[PDB]
Write a protein that binds this ligand. Sequence first.
Ligand code: KDO
Ligand code: KDO
Ligand code: KDO
Ligand code: KDO
Ligand code: MG
Ligand code: MG
Ligand code: MG
Ligand code: MG
Lengths: 173, 173, 174, 173
Amino acid sequence: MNEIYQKAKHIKLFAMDVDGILSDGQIIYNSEGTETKAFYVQDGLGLQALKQSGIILAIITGRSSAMVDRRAKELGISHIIQGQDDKLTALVGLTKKLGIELSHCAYIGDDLPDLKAVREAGFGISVPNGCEQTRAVSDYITTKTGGNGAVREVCELILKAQNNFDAFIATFQ
Amino acid sequence: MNEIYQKAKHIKLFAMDVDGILSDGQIIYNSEGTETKAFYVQDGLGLQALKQSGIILAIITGRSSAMVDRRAKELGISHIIQGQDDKLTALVGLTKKLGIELSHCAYIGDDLPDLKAVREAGFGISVPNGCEQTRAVSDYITTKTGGNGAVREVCELILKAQNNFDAFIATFQ
Amino acid sequence: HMNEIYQKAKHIKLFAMDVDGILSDGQIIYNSEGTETKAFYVQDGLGLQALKQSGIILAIITGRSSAMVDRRAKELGISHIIQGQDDKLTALVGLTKKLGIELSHCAYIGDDLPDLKAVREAGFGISVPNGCEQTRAVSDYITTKTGGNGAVREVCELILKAQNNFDAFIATFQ
Amino acid sequence: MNEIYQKAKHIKLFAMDVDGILSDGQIIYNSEGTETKAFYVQDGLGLQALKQSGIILAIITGRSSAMVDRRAKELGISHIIQGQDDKLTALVGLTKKLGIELSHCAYIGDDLPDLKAVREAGFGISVPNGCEQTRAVSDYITTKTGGNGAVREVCELILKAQNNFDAFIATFQ
Ligand SMILES: O=C(O)[C@@]1(O)C[C@@H](O)[C@@H](O)[C@@H]([C@H](O)CO)O1
Ligand SMILES: O=C(O)[C@@]1(O)C[C@@H](O)[C@@H](O)[C@@H]([C@H](O)CO)O1
Ligand SMILES: O=C(O)[C@@]1(O)C[C@@H](O)[C@@H](O)[C@@H]([C@H](O)CO)O1
Ligand SMILES: O=C(O)[C@@]1(O)C[C@@H](O)[C@@H](O)[C@@H]([C@H](O)CO)O1
Ligand SMILES: [Mg+2]
Ligand SMILES: [Mg+2]
Ligand SMILES: [Mg+2]
Ligand SMILES: [Mg+2]
């Protein structure tokens, strides 16, 4: 847990995958051509906290949806990359647009397109529903599953590692 | 048992958070622009019993939708405060608007905005899926999770504390 | 409790279901366009059709009221659909007088207090792991599978086994 | 662990039930007459993988919807058969039309309509949520449930049977 905290302490960008991370991985369709996606309410509040403690937020996702666009904006997530399977490339790109390198990125994913990004990121994170290969290259596995607070969980972990957890807690005490 | 019963026994007003308490915390979006939210049937029954026992019911949530409006109104929940993250201030307002006292209020919530209100209501309640900071400040933690009968459970428990449970049960025999 | 349950299920002619908490897991779902959604379980479908095919009359008795229930009820051959009814025991007896059969031959399943009297008086009353304590204490049988997750299928199989239609029912797919 | 490794190995056709396998079995309806079905994101990648190793994919399903044909088209499943409970007929019908043996078909089912098709396929699979009889007639039962990575799991098993797994992982390392 020592080495976990170093990696997190130095994080400047938090980059999330969507399906399996911000959601439980359910891809929903109905009979009139409309897709649906479910997100988790405590995730948003934890992401609002990291936003405001200086850390910038991004989404890199293989699919493309209005739901993701819609959710990211209300959460103050700023960089929205959709229809991108090549995750490490996308991550590196942001690093150079924002002037902080790979060492300064956190990234969280559940599945194979994610592994290289979770491997090279300064702080790579997977979840219990992530395949075994992505988990093995991760610096941290969440207690919680995607769509059920894994994102909020790492949100707190980084805030703890940056010493902004107590300030964030005190705001609501 | 009793250190928790006398807290519940002089409750006049029962106020609730929505997301994580009335629902399981899923924020559901779709590619048409429609939001969706799921509630639990047995919660309806519990609340109706509470209202019929003499208890005023309230909703204080930080989000805003028709769904909460629909649900509240079928359940005869008279005070519906939406779009409001500062729960304690809204709860005191009710206390004054209605001429009650914080001592006679029950507040249930699952996350940080709820902390002060859960803390300052005479009978504070949270849930297993709840924040550890919000839990550490509550007088009771439900066994059921939000959107799975946490609310019904606490309706049953308040009714017991008032000696109205057996009568309520008896209505259906 | 083990072999007396066999006896009550063998003479069932009418099988009547609560919806929310029984056919569905009890999620009541609304959206911003004003639309209501409800979920049902696929294996319950197949179990109903099989009960129906063995000569059993099927009935829905629910306190809420929606098109989803009418839509589901149609596809499954459920002929008697009573919606917007909290007074279950009396709607059931109403069916039982309309079909001219007694409560002894009526199976009823419910999960909550409104279903209590019906589960109690029915010839064979069933509850679920997720029903309240009171309606359960009153059931002749409690399912292993939860509402919306097979509770109906499980009781269907049960009635067929107690009717020597089970092994014939499996045979059709063997 | 074997029996299965040998029993798979010579699979050219992989055919799947939908309700209970690709989904968790919830049949979802709404008040505008709209029907919804959920699929699982990690199964998708699993299916592309098998399809990429040279294996032909098929759905055979008792019901019929836009959701299934949509999800099949995006996942490149080529043979989609709806409105058919006679799954052993249609699969045999597929084994002739395409020139494959049955011993080379793998088939996954969860309920009685799938019993025959599972039993007599070269490699027969069921899930934990499947009924007694269909499970007792299967060669392999997934650990993960229908609509939660059961399809993904067999996708990995087959690729590992055909010594094609490590190639797939490597693509992402
Ligand atoms: O609508 C509900 O949530 C509720 O639990 C409230 C009850 O008054 C009654 O309508 C009940 C029925 O048992 C389910 O329709 O549902
Ligand atoms: O919409 C949310 O996900 C969020 O977490 C955002 C927060 O600012 C706050 O509104 C939060 C509350 O817990 C809901 O009232 O919801
Ligand atoms: O729709 C269902 O619930 C049911 O179980 C009943 C039938 O319509 C039949 O097609 C069956 C299939 O085994 C699954 O679709 O589904
Ligand atoms: O759409 C999917 O099911 C799938 O798993 C397919 C993959 O090609 C890949 O794009 C994947 C993403 O990792 C999730 O959006 O989605
Ligand atoms: Mg993912
Ligand atoms: Mg909340
Ligand atoms: Mg019910
Ligand atoms: Mg099926």
